[PDB]
């Protein structure tokens, strides 16, 4: 009848898994608490924004980030789980890049943060590979026909970040000012950095 299977509440199941393992001595003291703090406080799109602002103001770093992203990220100390082999992909006046994991949720965790619910959604996983212009449009980002959209599907160990184009109106801004307009969605590729009116 296609009905869902009987299940205890998910919180009860998840804590049962914790307690089963913890009660056997298999989970070190503070271990899941430590990971929770890493996930919440260290893995962050503020890191990828820092990298973008550096690339925008430092042509030598830009070239390194685009040719050896792992080495560039390592200079900042931001390599980590789900972020060991990094490739940055450059937007240009004729090219917009967008990242997905159609098979699950793969994301450059240390520099983008853990993926948000929408990126893990079946809607994004099914649709952005086939109709990225319509998906971006519905999300609030218009990409003109004069621009190729290129979708990177994160199917192996490469972990990607988008280097968006730097918008007009930001000439001479400091790295801190530039970082503020590079959002998580700009690093994933579904948004373009916005400059205040």
């Amino acid at each position: 009848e296609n009905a869902a299977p009987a299940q205890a509440p998910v919180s009860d199941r998840a804590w049962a898994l914790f307690r089963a393992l913890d009660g056997k001595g298999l989970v070190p003291d503070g271990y899941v608490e430590g990971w929770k703090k890493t996930f919440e406080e260290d893995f962050s799109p503020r890191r990828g924004a820092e990298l973008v602002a550096r690339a925008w103001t430092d042509p030598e770093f830009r070239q390194l980030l685009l040719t050896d992203g792992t080495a560039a990220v390592a200079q900042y100390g931001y390599l980590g789980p789900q972020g060991e082999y990094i490739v940055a992909v450059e937007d240009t006046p004729t090219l917009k890049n967008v990242i997905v994991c159609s098979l699950c949720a793969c994301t450059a965790w240390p520099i983008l943060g853990l993926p948000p619910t929408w990126y893990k959604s079946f809607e994004y996983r099914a649709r952005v590979v086939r109709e990225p212009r319509k998906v971006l449009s519905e999300m609030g980002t218009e990409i003109a026909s004069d621009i190729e959209i290129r979708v990177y599907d994160t199917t192996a160990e490469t972990r990607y970040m988008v280097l968006p184009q730097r918008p007009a109106g930001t000439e001479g801004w400091s790295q801190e000012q530039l970082q503020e307009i590079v959002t998580k969605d700009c690093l994933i590729g579904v948004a373009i950095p916005q400059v205040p009116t």
Binding site: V10, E123, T155
Partner: protein
Amino acid sequence: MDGVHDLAGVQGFGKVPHTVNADIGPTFHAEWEHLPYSLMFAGVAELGAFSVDEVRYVVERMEPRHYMMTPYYERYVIGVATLMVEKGILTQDELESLAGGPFPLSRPSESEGRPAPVETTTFEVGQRVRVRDEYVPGHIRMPAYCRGRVGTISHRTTEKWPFPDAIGHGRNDAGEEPTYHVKFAAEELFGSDTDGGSVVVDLFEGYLEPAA
């Protein structure tokens, strides 16, 4: 495995539930949600009980309707629990006793996996490759939309990793291979029924062959 998780290209879904820069809320929306990844890392890095690839495959092995109705982080609770049972670390009885009710798991694997292929080719940037026209019932990191399709190499990784189709089953013969960023024209993958430009898939060497 040609499972329902292989979603790219499926038609009929609605809007993505986000508009750009909208509030996504906290990292975790419930107090248990950090547990699946934390306990996955305990399994991989502290216990040595399974690989990350085995976690992807056990989630693929959820019964298909169960997969489709389960939120993301819950799929990983189910997947990590399943691997703990399969590896002999936990029993389903104790999980259900602690949970106070049913805790259905992913289904058993129907494939033993396959080894890293013995014959492969080192490709160079600019070369034309075809994705091998092969069907793999166990784990594979090839989305079906690119099976049999031709594209061009844009990158060869400078590192190598175990072949997913072996390490995702806990086999001893995963070897190591580099992967390749293969750029496909949108029309190669979806004919006229696409609005995009190109799609780049990051494909293990053992999924590829010279085009022609």
